[PDB]
DNA sequence: TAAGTCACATGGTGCCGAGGCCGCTCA
DNA sequence: TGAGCGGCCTCGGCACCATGTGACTTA
């Protein structure tokens, strides 16, 4: 499932070429949010020592992220 | 054809159909393919479904694909970027279909690898970069870094499985470029997507269309079978991916290379690779000639590397060390069938009882691959060694109690072929003929070759020996001794008593040949009367029916032969002493004459069929008695009135060019004054 | 169950012919010893004639009750049909034996001539290989070759990724 | 978990000379070690011509795992039909470069080694006898597990294992008597007497010694960092002609 | 071999030639296609091309002082083209954060 | 400092339901 | 040519023993 499929998801959520580029940049930003959140989740899991992450880890990470945003 | 590029220049509906049918009949040339793809890519007035129909149905090459066609195609596979906006974007489905058509048919490897970063091309670029990587030096850590970076990159679909396939091919290819299996571990571990990627379909209807077009194309340039084999091996390379002043011999790629640097050629000590086994010239392109090149560069002696390799890989086969003792056995056979020193060394070190005990199948194969070509270096001592070897293998076969074991007979056939090779040369012919006599003595012993426990292997070896004797007797220019064509009476009467029709035919052939040789010899010698005894006994047993009146038959007086007939009950005692001592009374030739009689009845469309299942005088008389008025006018074989005429008419049909029993008919037509006119 | 009957009669007839052959051999050597005292060292030329009289007695008996069963075709006994099956499988493969033997003999002649040609070629090439003469900084060379490789690969990357419309093999 | 791949060598190659060429080719110094071991020290296993030559080639860079610790072990005896075999652990890509250099320098013929059933039993016998610094041999008992994968029609019996605990194995050995080959003399005859299975005839894929090693038909993987002398010797008699 | 015996009875130059050919082919490519398609520096292609050859020469020689500072605004599309090739390492300097040290990946290693 | 006991955290073999593609397969 | 059942088989979740190492104690 490519990034263009996520752009299709976003356009069907909101419903030419320049708006396609805008939505593609939006999909890239969404992937950046997910990657940063998962990186914070691993950082906190390694801080606690657990090999995997858990829902409370990533909930705390995303609350700390949205606190700054 | 000119219609194809005429339509191409016209395009610069009817034209499309004409191009399709002329491609399906002739196929385009490489400049024609260049012009067609150049016209198709640059314009966009042509429909895209017709574009993919063209690239899947019209592009049909005739010969080599030139480099200029690939360069022109590569110009069209690019994309508009910030440094190139004037050129229009080629449709991605057209690019993917063109790459798929490329699948259907050091710089260029990097060209195709840098085009692999395109997302839509990845489903067909991967076989090209697999097939380009043929040498370990082709791969490099920068290629691995780019492949891993694009593989683990998001936004792609086919990149994980296909790039895992690329990395698997690289791991199977180089065995270097420090370990990359953990990089494979970092990429997907599903074994499903690359499982579907490792087998690829090429639209076998289009493959058959190109097959027939290319078969219509150039003689001795892409024949159909080699094209199918090349396509099959290119697909199997994808399929089995689951598991400076002097020049080295590896880097030599063409026959032109060996000339100017033969005194500057360095042969390596990498014997296992160059002896264990493509349109590109590489190290494996000239792998066939490496074994001979070593023995030319280093003068022939029993210390060279191919000799040691053949000896070691044959000892591994004998000791059951190799898993598959059928991949290197043809290699050893091909190397050592020639090169007399190696074959003689193998014969001296392996043709004995000890290695026969270890594995008789591999010994049988190496006897088939070495013995028929061997010519000895030392004449003395070869005969005694071969008698010892044949005696050892004969005891080994006969102690088992199983008469199905045919290794002794098969190796005997091989050494008779060696004797054929020996007697083809005028020198050392006495050794070969004496060895032939020893083999005839071993073949006729009643341990394998009996009248109850049959062995057609021994009969085949015997008739092979008789064929070689007949072919030897026709050579006038060789002054061999007269005593080496007889085999003694004890073999000849025994094989006359044997009930094998092919063997009796071979014996008659041997008699015909040895009499035609013996006619210029004096009429009264030690062996002329021996041949006379042979022919009189065989004619009396075959046609005369006068066995009881003779002095002896096959060295046995007819009183015992009559006493066997006594106490031997026959249902009808009309003609008992002459019923079954003839051509129709021989055990090997009884039903054969009935088959011949039935075929003669069928050929003449006779309404009367010989109902009795035996041809004898009593049955013949009863058959004429039951249908006398029908026989008298018409409805049976013409020109026959008695049993002797029936036998002559049978002998006519055995002399035709349809049976392997020519020689018995010629024997009866030769040494019988009554039958001398039927020759 | 008929296949069991045919298999059974097959090993019975195998043991039958084996025991009859060895019985005939033992009977004849018993006659030889009983006429003599201990003469058992008979030569090969006499043992062979013993084998010959054994062979002619065997095939004479085979023909003798071949006369008994094939003279009048009853076409009802299954032994009769067994005889035609045995005969039609015996005489079927006779021509293919000699055909394969002749073809493989022609193959052997091809082996002989190919070996002679290769012996001549090896002799000539050993004679020529003894007439050739014997076989006889780089710090910046490897560096400039590495520079050449890097420059040409960068040239390939710049030609492809920029959309330049003339890709060619530039040395 | 260090898998040892075994390859035989057609010639007795001497490694104390020419290894500087390998050092120059690999741009790193290797730690070649020379030893002269005498493995069948028992009187019933032979008392003459028992000496072997043991080479321990080691691509030494760092010591964290087998990615930088792909060892090479060579064993040799000049009084044999086949004079040398090698076994190497790890998964580094430099190992096949070492094998290619060994071929192209010494002109040797190298083939992979496959173990038979009796060879695997003898290897399990060899891998418990441990040599001590006091020059004594100690049998360390391990709970073995013979593991079979038979091929039957319709895949009726895919696999079956025979687990033998440690104390039962030493009880069988003491029941047989004072012997130095416990598996071939006590364990396997007991299995044959009890269950009717001749494990030297059945398809035996691995015998697993719990915590020490688990040898297979084509590889030997050991928890211990090295391979003892008895296993190397039994492999050397395994490939003889 | 008979022919070679009859003939015989009676290198660095192409390496440097190919090096100079690659140099002049790169020069012609950059002075005719890439910079004119960039159409920057008020159509004064050679003035920008001198800096482009300086950066390429530093990249080929593997200069350790290469970074994002010496790349001008006109060379930003050229650097983006180089980055799209995936043939360069983009690593931020530990001593100077924010300065991305840039060098090509090794095209000659046989590890 | 060599050896031992300990819980601990990761490695690993075996097992099975879900589901997918394959593998002919037959009308 | 086209739908179609069945062995395969791998994903992966679970279950359990197996295992190597640091912390701590004993001598």
UniProtKB/Swiss-Prot annotation, chain B:
Gene Ontology CC terms: kinetochore; nucleus
Keyword Translocase: no
Residues with PTM N-acetylserine: 1
Superkingdom of the source species: Eukaryota
One BP term from GO: attachment of spindle microtubules to kinetochore
Entry keyword set: Acetylation, Cell cycle, Cell division, Centromere, Chromosome, Kinetochore, Meiosis, Mitosis, Nucleus
Keyword match Transferase: no
Entry's localization field: Nucleus; Chromosome, Centromere, Kinetochore
Other known facts: Present with 319 molecules/cell in log phase SD medium.
Job description of the protein: Component of the central kinetochore, which mediates the attachment of the centromere to the mitotic spindle by forming essential interactions between the microtubule-associated outer kinetochore proteins and the centromere-associated inner kinetochore proteins. Required for establishing bipolar spindle-microtubule attachments and proper chromosome segregation. Component of the kinetochore, a multiprotein complex that assembles on centromeric DNA and attaches chromosomes to spindle microtubules, mediating chromosome segregation and sister chromatid segregation during meiosis and mitosis. Component of the inner kinetochore constitutive centromere-associated network (CCAN), which serves as a structural platform for outer kinetochore assembly.
Family note: Belongs to the CENP-I/CTF3 family.
Identification of the protein by name: Inner kinetochore subunit CTF3
Curated annotation (Swiss-Prot), chain C:
Pfam families found in the cross-reference section: CENPH
Keyword NADP belongs to the record: no
Transmembrane segments: none
Subcellular location field: Nucleus; Chromosome, Centromere, Kinetochore
Biological-process GO terms, alphabetical: attachment of spindle microtubules to kinetochore; cell division; chromosome segregation; establishment of mitotic sister chromatid cohesion; meiotic cell cycle
Coiled coil residues, start to end: 109-161
Main location: nucleus
Keywords attached to this entry: Cell cycle, Cell division, Centromere, Chromosome, Coiled coil, Kinetochore, Meiosis, Mitosis, Nucleus
GO cellular component term of the entry, any: nucleus
Free-text function comment from the UniProt entry: Component of the kinetochore, a multiprotein complex that assembles on centromeric DNA and attaches chromosomes to spindle microtubules, mediating chromosome segregation and sister chromatid segregation during meiosis and mitosis. Component of the inner kinetochore constitutive centromere-associated network (CCAN), which serves as a structural platform for outer kinetochore assembly.
Note: Present with 279 molecules/cell in log phase SD medium.
Family: Belongs to the CENP-H/MCM16 family.
Oligomeric and partner information: Component of the heterotrimeric kinetochore subcomplex CTF3, which consists of CTF3, MCM16 and MCM22. The CTF3 subcomplex is part of a larger constitutive centromere-associated network (CCAN) (also known as central kinetochore CTF19 complex in yeast), which is composed of at least AME1, CHL4, CNN1, CTF3, CTF19, IML3, MCM16, MCM21, MCM22, MHF1, MHF2, MIF2, NKP1, NKP2, OKP1 and WIP1. Interacts with CTF19.
Curated annotation (Swiss-Prot), chain D:
One record GO biological process: attachment of spindle microtubules to kinetochore
Note: Present with 125 molecules/cell in log phase SD medium.
Gene name tied to this protein: IML3
Keyword flag Transport: no
Protein name: Inner kinetochore subunit IML3
Function according to Swiss-Prot or TrEMBL: Component of the kinetochore, a multiprotein complex that assembles on centromeric DNA and attaches chromosomes to spindle microtubules, mediating chromosome segregation and sister chromatid segregation during meiosis and mitosis. Component of the inner kinetochore constitutive centromere-associated network (CCAN), which serves as a structural platform for outer kinetochore assembly.
Keyword line: Cell cycle, Cell division, Centromere, Chromosome, Kinetochore, Meiosis, Mitosis, Nucleus
Family, per entry: Belongs to the CENP-L/IML3 family.
Main location: nucleus
Binding partners and assembly: Forms a heterodimer with IML3. CHL4-IML3 is part of a larger constitutive centromere-associated network (CCAN) (also known as central kinetochore CTF19 complex in yeast), which is composed of at least AME1, CHL4, CNN1, CTF3, CTF19, IML3, MCM16, MCM21, MCM22, MHF1, MHF2, MIF2, NKP1, NKP2, OKP1 and WIP1. Interacts with CHL4 and CTF19.
Lineage: superkingdom: Eukaryota
GO cellular component terms given for this protein: kinetochore; nucleus; outer kinetochore
Organism: Saccharomyces cerevisiae (strain ATCC 204508 / S288c)
Compartments reported by the entry: Nucleus; Chromosome, Centromere, Kinetochore
Swiss-Prot record, chain E:
Compartments, record wording: Nucleus; Chromosome, Centromere, Kinetochore
Highest taxon in the source lineage: Eukaryota
Membrane-traversing stretches: none
Biological role stated in the UniProt entry: Component of the kinetochore, a multiprotein complex that assembles on centromeric DNA and attaches chromosomes to spindle microtubules, mediating chromosome segregation and sister chromatid segregation during meiosis and mitosis. Component of the inner kinetochore constitutive centromere-associated network (CCAN), which serves as a structural platform for outer kinetochore assembly.
Subunit comment: Component of the heterotrimeric kinetochore subcomplex CTF3, which consists of CTF3, MCM16 and MCM22. The CTF3 subcomplex is part of a larger constitutive centromere-associated network (CCAN) (also known as central kinetochore CTF19 complex in yeast), which is composed of at least AME1, CHL4, CNN1, CTF3, CTF19, IML3, MCM16, MCM21, MCM22, MHF1, MHF2, MIF2, NKP1, NKP2, OKP1 and WIP1. Interacts with CTF19.
Family, per entry: Belongs to the CENP-K/MCM22 family.
Other facts noted in the record for this chain: Present with 1026 molecules/cell in log phase SD medium.
Protein name: Inner kinetochore subunit MCM22
Lineage: Eukaryota, Fungi, Dikarya, Ascomycota, Saccharomycotina
């Amino acid at each position: 499932m490519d990034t263009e499929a996520l752009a299709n998801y976003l356009l069907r959520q909101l419903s030419s070429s320049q708006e396609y580029n805008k939505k593609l940049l939006l999909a890239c930003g969404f992937q950046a949010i997910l990657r940063k959140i998962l990186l914070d989740a691993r950082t906190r899991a390694t801080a606690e020592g657990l090999r995997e992450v858990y829902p409370y880890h990533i909930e705390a990470a995303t609350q700390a992220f949205l606190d700054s945003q | 054809s000119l219609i194809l590029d005429d339509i191409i220049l016209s395009l610069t509906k009817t034209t499309l159909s004409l191009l399709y049918e002329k491609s399906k009949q002739y196929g385009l040339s490489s400049p024609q393919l260049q012009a067609l793809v150049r016209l198709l890519c640059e314009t966009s007035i042509i429909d895209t479904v017709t574009k993919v129909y063209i690239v899947e149905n019209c592009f049909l090459p005739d010969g080599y694909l030139t480099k200029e066609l690939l360069l022109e195609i590569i110009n069209h596979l690019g994309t508009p970027t910030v440094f190139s906006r004037y050129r229009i974007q080629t449709p991605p489905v057209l690019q993917s279909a063109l790459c798929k058509w490329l699948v259907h048919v050091n710089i260029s490897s990097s060209i195709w690898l840098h085009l692999w970063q395109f997302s839509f091309l990845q489903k067909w670029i991967t076989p090209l970069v697999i097939w380009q990587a043929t040498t370990p030096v082709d791969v490099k850590p920068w290629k691995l870094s780019i492949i891993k970076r694009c593989a683990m990159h998001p936004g792609y679909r086919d990149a994980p499985g296909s790039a895992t396939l690329i990395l698997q091919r690289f791991q199977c290819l180089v065995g270097a470029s420090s370990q990359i299996t953990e990089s494979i571990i970092t990429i997907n571990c599903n074994r499903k997507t690359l499982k579907s990627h490792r087998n690829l379909k090429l639209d076998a209807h289009f493959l058959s269309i190109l097959k027939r077009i290319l078969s219509r194309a150039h003689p001795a340039n892409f024949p159909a079978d080699t094209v199918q084999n090349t396509i099959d091996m290119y697909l199997s390379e994808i399929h089995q991916l689951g598991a400076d002043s002097t020049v080295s011999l590896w880097d030599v790629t063409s026959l032109e290379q060996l000339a100017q640097n033969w005194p500057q050629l360095h042969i390596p000590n990498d014997v296992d690779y160059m002896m264990k086994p493509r349109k590109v010239m590489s190290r494996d392109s000239l792998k066939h000639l490496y074994s001979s090149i070593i023995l030319i560069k280093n003068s022939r002696d029993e210390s060279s590397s191919p000799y040691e390799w053949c000896i070691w890989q044959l000892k591994r086969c004998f000791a059951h060390q190799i898993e598959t003792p059928q991949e290197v056995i043809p290699i050893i056979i091909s190397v050592s069938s020639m090169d007399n020193k190696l074959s003689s060394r193998i014969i001296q070190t392996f043709c004995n009882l000890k290695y026969l005990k270890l594995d008789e199948l591999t010994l049988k194969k190496v006897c088939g691959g070495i013995l028929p070509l061997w010519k000895p270096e030392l004449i003395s001592g070869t005969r005694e060694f071969f008698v010892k070897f044949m005696a050892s293998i004969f005891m080994w076969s006969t102690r088992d109690g199983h008469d199905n074991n045919c290794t002794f007979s098969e190796t005997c056939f091989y050494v008779l072929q060696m004797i054929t090779n020996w007697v083809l040369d005028d020198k050392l012919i006495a050794l070969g003929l004496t060895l032939l006599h020893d083999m005839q003595s071993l073949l006729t012993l009643d341990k394998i070759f009996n009248n109850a426990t049959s062995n057609r292997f021994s009969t085949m070896a015997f008739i092979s020996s008789l064929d070689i004797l007949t072919q030897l007797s026709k050579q006038t220019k060789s002054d061999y001794a007269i005593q080496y064509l007889i085999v003694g009476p004890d073999i000849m009467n025994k094989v006359f008593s044997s009930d094998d029709p092919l063997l009796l035919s071979a014996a008659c052939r041997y008699l015909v040949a040895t009499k035609n040789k013996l006619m210029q010899y004096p009429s009264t010698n030690k062996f002329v009367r021996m041949q006379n005894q042979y022919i009189m006994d065989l004619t009396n047993y075959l046609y005369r029916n006068k066995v009881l009146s003779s002095k002896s038959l096959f060295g046995v007086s007819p009183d015992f032969f009559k006493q066997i007939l006594e106490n031997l009950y026959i249902p009808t005692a009309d003609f008992k002493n002459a019923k079954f001592f003839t051509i129709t009374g021989i055990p090997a030739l009884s039903y054969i004459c009935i088959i011949i009689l039935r075929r003669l009845e069928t050929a003449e469309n006779t309404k009367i069929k010989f109902t009795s299942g035996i041809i004898n005088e009593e049955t013949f008389n009863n058959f004429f008695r039951v249908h006398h008025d029908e026989i008298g006018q018409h409805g049976w074989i013409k020109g026959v009135n008695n049993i002797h005429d029936l036998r002559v008419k049978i002998l006519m049909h055995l002399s035709n060019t349809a049976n392997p029993y020519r020689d018995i008919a010629a024997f009866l037509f030769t040494y019988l004054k009554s039958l001398s006119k039927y020759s | 169950s008929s296949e069991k009957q045919w298999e059974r009669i097959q090993q019975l007839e195998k043991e039958h012919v084996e025991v009859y052959r060895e019985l005939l051999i033992t009977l004849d050597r018993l006659y030889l010893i009983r006429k003599h005292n201990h003469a058992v060292i008979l030569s090969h030329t006499q043992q062979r004639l013993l084998e010959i009289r054994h062979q002619l007695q065997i095939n004479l008996e085979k023909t003798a009750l071949l006369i008994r069963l094939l003279e009048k075709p009853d076409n009802t006994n299954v032994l009769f049909t067994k005889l035609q099956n045995l005969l039609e499988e015996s005489n079927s493969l006779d021509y293919e034996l000699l055909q394969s033997l002749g073809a493989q003999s022609s193959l052997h002649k091809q082996l002989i001539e190919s070996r002679a040609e290769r012996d001549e070629l090896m002799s000539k090439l050993i004679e020529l290989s003894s007439k050739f003469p014997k076989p006889t900084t780089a710090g910046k060379q490897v560096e400039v070759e590495k520079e050449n490789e890097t420059i040409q690969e960068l040239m390939i990357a710049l030609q492809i990724h920029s959309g330049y419309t003339n890709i060619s093999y530039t040395i | 978990p260090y898998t040892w791949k075994f390859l035989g060598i057609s010639k007795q190659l001497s490694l104390e000379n020419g290894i500087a060429k390998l050092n120059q080719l690999l741009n790193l110094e290797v730690d070649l070690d020379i030893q002269t071991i005498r493995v069948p020290s028992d009187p019933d296993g032979g008392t003459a011509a028992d000496e072997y030559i043991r080479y321990e080639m080691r691509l030494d860079i760092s010591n964290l795992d087998e990615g930088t610790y792909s060892k090479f072990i060579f064993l040799g005896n000049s009084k044999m039909e086949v004079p040398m075999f090698l076994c190497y652990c790890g998964t580094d890509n430099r190992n096949e470069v070492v094998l290619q250099w060994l071929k192209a320098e010494y002109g040797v013929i190298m083939w992979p080694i496959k173990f038979e059933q009796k060879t695997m039993i003898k290897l399990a016998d060899a891998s418990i006898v441990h040599v001590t610094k006091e020059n004594i041999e100690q049998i360390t008992w391990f709970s073995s597990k013979l593991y079979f994968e038979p091929e039957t029609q319709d895949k009726n019996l895919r696999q079956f294992s025979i687990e033998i605990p440690r104390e039962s194995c030493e009880g069988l050995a003491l029941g047989y008597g004072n012997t130095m080959h416990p598996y071939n003399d006590a364990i396997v005859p007991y299995i044959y007497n009890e269950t009717g299975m001749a494990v030297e005839r059945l398809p035996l894929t691995s015998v697993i010694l719990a915590g020490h090693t688990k040898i297979m038909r084509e590889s030997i993987v050991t928890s211990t960092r090295s391979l003892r002398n008895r296993v190397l010797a039994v492999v050397l008699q395994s490939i003889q002609f | 071999l008979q022919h070679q015996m009859t003939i015989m009875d009676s290198h660095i130059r192409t390496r440097k030639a190919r090096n100079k050919e690659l140099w002049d082919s790169l020069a012609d490519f950059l002075k005719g296609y890439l910079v004119p398609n960039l159409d920057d520096n008020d159509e004064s292609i050679d003035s920008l091309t001198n800096e482009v050859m300086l950066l390429m020469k530093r990249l080929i020689e593997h200069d350790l002082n290469l970074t994002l500072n010496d790349f001008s605004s006109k060379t930003i599309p050229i650097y983006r083209l180089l980055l799209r090739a995936n043939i360069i390492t983009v690593i931020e300097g530990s001593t100077n954060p924010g300065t991305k040290y840039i060098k090509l990946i090794d095209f000659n290693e046989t590890s």
